[PDB]
Ligand SMILES: Nc1ncnc2c1ncn2[C@@H]1O[C@H](COP(=O)(O)OP(=O)(O)O)[C@@H](O)[C@H]1O
């Protein structure tokens with residue numbers, strides 16, 4: 062890197078030998094032939110209803126006047142009765158008592174920090190307060206409000222659209238990856254932090270916004286950490302941009318310092334007392350204990366809804382059916398009030414999200430009707446369900462973990478932090494004195510649980526982050542002003558990986574491939590695989606595989622019904638090719654037979670998750686549009702062609718050649734090309750005899766090291782496709798890999814001369 066790296070046939074240029082790079086160059090030239098247009102202009106309504114209001118000199122009183130008026134200032138329409146009822150209710154939120162104090166701070170500072178307990182009205186009200194003082198629409202801009210969580214962004218936008226008496230997708234909208242609900246009319250845009258990051262990649266100054274509100278900063282996601290850095294600089298280049306940092310942690314010092322001694326507004330807490338119940342003994346099996354305590358609460362405690370925290374969608378759906386079924390049994394057998402039960406988790410469709418806010422069912426019984434929401438930690442600080450009085454806290458969540466010594470992420474179910482435990486308990490005290498049932502000991506809470514979780518950036522593989530920073534035009538990656546810097550070595554490794562992928566050249570600059578990959582909301586390996594696929598004559602099939610990989614395991618395997626579940630899977634299963642299996646299932650899911658059969662019944666009878674398949678369907682559609690937009694041809698070859706499956710395996714390889722494992726000759730296990738790790742094929746797939754080399758999607762770390770979602774690949778293909786990576790010079794000494802790598806190359810040379 063110091064002097065220009067030299068390349069040669071023995072140590073080749075990864076960019077020059079990248080098949081996907083070749084595709085990107087073809088696509089780039091096509092685009093350069095018909096340069097795509099610019100963003101459609103924003104549009105707004107102005108009939109003088111804002112006359113008399115002066116930007117940045119607004120008051121709560123003036124705003125209230127408009128809100129109290131008969132006609133909606135942002136539109137031309139009469140305010141509805143629904144609106145007025147919602148209006149008087151939300152005016153009770155703690156944030157309203159400080160509206161004027163907030164405006165003052167907003168008016169006199171470019172950056173401010175805003176802290177308050179969840180439920181106090183931060184996400185719903187504040188951005189509305191800003192619309193009145195900022196009148197962004199009259200100056201041709203919007204205001205962004207960023208959420209770490211998709212569900213918070215979607216549901217809160219739906220609510221705020223109601224609070225503003227406008228249509229969702231119009232004046233108030235949301236933007237999520239693969240799911241956009243905005244238009245030329247949108248003024249207030251709730252969105253994931255990931256999506257604003259992506260907007261910034263296209264427009265470094267985020268010129269479309271006059272105010273950016275980074276919310277739930279206390280979660281310290283990668284995306285908000287990056288946005289905080291970026292915005293700390295953008296703010297020097299645009300005096301017209303205002304920035305609000307919102308957080309639930311009444312801790313602000315560190316944030317204020319980071320943002321050049323920015324001022325702080327704190328909302329006093331209004332939470333009612335919450336009585337804490339602990340288990341006397343350690344609880345080995347929390348699910349059934351959680352279920353038991355929900356039913357006990359419902360049968361014995363007075364009115365008040367229940368919030369149960371679980372860990373993931375499968376577990377949650379399982380608990381929904383068990384609690385639902387036992388609830389019904391309690392009505393008929395003991396005369397309990399009705400008990401409604403709702404799931405909440407990351408992938409829920411919007412309609413279903415909205416169900417959690419439904420009133421508890423009325424009892425015609427004399428015993429209280431009651432709602433149970435069974436939620437992931439979305440319900441920890443990201444949103445509130447009015448009427449919760451009881452929380453059940455098993456003490457676990459799904460957390461990203463990184464391993465520097467093995468260089469790999471993995472999502473594990475792990476004990477929560479004490480701060481998280483505190484937040485969960487707090488949800489019980491929003492409306493009245495509540496109770497929180499912790500499925501662990503008081504000792505464990507006081508001495509075992511870690512105080513605070515580490516920021517995501519310190520628990521992350523940074524290959525996506527590096528490509529993003531590069532796209533943002535950041536050259537000095539080491540000195541990017543992170544609030545908590547990652548270890549330099551994780552960054553270096555990411556740069557190297559991106560170079561091998563040919564997204565960056567050896568001097569750290571974007572290639573045509575890197576530039577194009579940055580246009581897809583996908584991990585670099587996936588985007589590269591997709592980009593190159595038309596060069597392998599199978600972009601239609603790679604399209605579906607990438608969509609299928611962007612979604613949870615689709616196959617349902619009940620513990621008590623394994624045999625039939627497996628029978629069903631084998632209908633689609635491809636030997637030595639889990640990746641092909643995904644293609645089969647999706648193709649069948651889209652079949653006329655399936656549709657004729659009744660799609661939902663079809664998935665159920667086939668042990669398939671309709672929710673995941675439908676999400677894959679939408680993702681495929683959105684990806685196709687990107688491919689049309691950037692001129693990546695949609696390719697396929699005849700299924701009857703001896704090269705069909707070959708092409709697919711090769712395209713997979715072009716992206717995943719660094720996630721390859723070779724069959725251990727002596728130990729009858731597997732060894733990974735990168736880092737030389739001993740691993741076993743995950744139990745969920747059966748290896749065939751001719752599968753000496755496999756490409757794997759995932760590294761799973763239970764008690765042993767497993768490799769999951771594998772497809773066989775010919776070694777000569779790896780060498781042919783990624784010569785720079787499969788150069789024995791950088792290969793450590795012997796075990797089986799280098800050794801049999803040499804053998805492969807020998808065999809390959811030996812074949813040339815004869816002819
Ligand atoms: N669909 C909904 N989404 C969010 N909040 C709602 C919804 N329906 C009613 N509310 C009410 O409005 C408030 C939403 O507060 P929220 O602005 O999300 O605050 P914060 O962001 O500070 O946790 C809750 O206190 C609740 O009383």
Ligand SMILES: [Mg+2]
Pocket residue numbers: 183184185276442443444
């Ligand atoms: Mg909020």
